[PDB]
Write a protein that binds this DNA or RNA. Structure first.
Length: 97
DNA sequence: TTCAATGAAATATATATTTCTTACTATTTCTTTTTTAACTTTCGGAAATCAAATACACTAATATTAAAACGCGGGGGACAGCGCGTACGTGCGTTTAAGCGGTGCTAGAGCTGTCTACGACCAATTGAGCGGCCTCGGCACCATGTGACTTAT
């Protein structure tokens, strides 16, 4: 049954504590974003521990948002998180908006 | 009978296992020198009393009056069951880019010496505003000297 494997990997990710997004692509993403903010005279410089810090905060925020979306999904009688549910979570928590 | 084959016991040896020993390294502790906290007066300014004296928010009493509570009904909406369907999950199969380890190198972080330069603090001048006093010019009044006129010597 798909539910058995799904719940098994839910268990392993409930007691998992590793990063889930690829390090080199994430570093490139923040790299190119902060070059986008920059003037043409220079280029910024970054450090690995800063990269881990930003990624850690990013996924803290993401896990909070996703669990709130799951709670909205339970409210809406649907086990599927959908576009309107995610919109509602973003609005209600209303950070930097 | 005499000799040969076999069995039993002691012994020598091979082997595997355990323990001692030793090398290497990481951890803990002793030692010396350096920063950073610690102890001592000092003085000024903040903070703890003491006496007013004036806003200030209940607590009383009371009518109009808007607001709130009870009751019956009805039509709207929440809820539930059945049914068609699809969109997300899965099952494999490749293949793609992530992860890790070396390679260089150059832009850039970090500590130090130095000079310049803002800036806090203090001193003194200046401007501005408000009266207050001084000073000069002006009507009301009496005082005054001279000309005109008259009289008698």
């Amino acid at each position: 049954t798909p539910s058995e494997l799904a719940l098994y990997e839910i268990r392993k990710y409930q007691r998992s504590t590793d990063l889930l997004i690829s390090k080199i692509p994430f570093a490139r993403l923040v790299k190119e974003v902060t070059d986008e903010f920059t003037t043409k005279d220079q280029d910024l410089r970054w450090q690995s521990m800063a990269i881990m810090a930003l990624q850690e905060a990013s996924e803290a925020y993401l896990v909070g948002l996703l669990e709130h979306t799951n709670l909205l999904a339970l409210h809406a009688k649907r086990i599927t998180i959908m576009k309107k549910d995610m919109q509602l979570a973003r609005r209600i928590r209303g950070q930097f908006i």
